[model samples]
Target: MNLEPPKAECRSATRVMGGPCTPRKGPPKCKQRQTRQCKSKPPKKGVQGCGDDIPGMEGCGTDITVICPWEACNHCELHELAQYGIC
Candidate 1:
């Protein structure tokens, strides 16, 4: 039997900071590994905000950490091109 995955709680806004997709300095055309920090916004009033430990209404505002992995340089280049409508 297939089990359903647990749904995420503690509705919060996510923001990514400082994720520069630069190519690595090597023969391989791959992006350099970078640490992208993720942060959650504060919950609004009267709403189930993050960091709440309420049973059946738990929040995950306090658990927002992520690590970006290396990717193909062509992907990054394509992304840049898309931004400028060059792709």
Candidate 2:
């Protein structure tokens, strides 16, 4: 008998921000922020036992979705109080 290994299926989605402009004092400025996709790699597979008498592998893993800190951005304009004299 032949045994087949399991396959992995990954998914992704688009992210967007800063579509419209708000009333502002400085020339009605509008900025758009967008992201490509939510992507990741599959987890590693553990050792598989063919016979019932053999013990199965202990180390195994799976994939999961997580927030990307570098991809995060502000959609709205910065306020004077929060701008810290940088803007």
Candidate 3:
């Protein structure tokens, strides 16, 4: 996938039609790790996403949504915290 760093700024789905500001890349190990904790975060307004539970394939685009660190923390997926990279 066209892996790119997440936006430095965050947007809230609370106001937008989309569910939330999802990550641009995923399966995190796919790229070099981000050196620090993430600055931006996803919406906390009950925005939903297809996380690891979805189980999608790499090329088929059915893979789960590898959530950013902020969302990971929110959901208490500590195992994913460091994966998001740019904290």
Candidate 4:
């Protein structure tokens, strides 16, 4: 329902006794996720996210994850080898 990004956190259940590094469904989720839990989830590990599988809202989330060059490479100028004096 909320298009705006909410103040939230992630939790992991498999690695932690409490839960997994899950996205906040509402304004507030459980107390700050446990240290080990955070490691298991590793939210910001790469330029891309967890295999594009958004847990709660898979349908809408998938659209958000699309990384076609149209969006991902927009305005990124490439360096020419000749210009850099390589050739």
Candidate 3 local lDDT, 34-64, one digit each (tens): 4243324553432333223223344324223
Evaluated against the true structure, the overall lDDT of model 1 is 0.41
Question: What total of clashing residue pairs does each candidate reach?
Answer: 0, 0, 7, 9
**Residue pairs in collision within model 3:** 36-87, 37-86, 37-87, 38-86, 38-87, 56-62, 56-63
Candidate 1, 55: how far from true, in Å?
27
Evaluate residue 62 in candidate 2 and report its C-alpha lDDT on the 0 to 100 scale: 24
TM-score of 2: 0.11
Please report the candidate that would top lDDT against the real structure: 4
Q: Which lDDT tens digits does candidate 4 get at residues 1-87?
A: 757887455554355454555656655444653343334444662432344443556634454566543465444345324344564
Q: 2 or 3, which is superior by lDDT?
A: 3
**Model 1 agreement with the true structure over 1-87: per-residue lDDT tens digits:** 567866655356455433766655645433542223212455453332334344344443333323222333244422354545563
Pairing residues by index, what is the TM-score of model 1?
0.14
Worst 10 residues of 2 by lDDT: 46-55
lDDT of 2 by residue, 1-87 (tens): 567765543345334434586755765333532222212333332222222322234322221124332234333233325335453
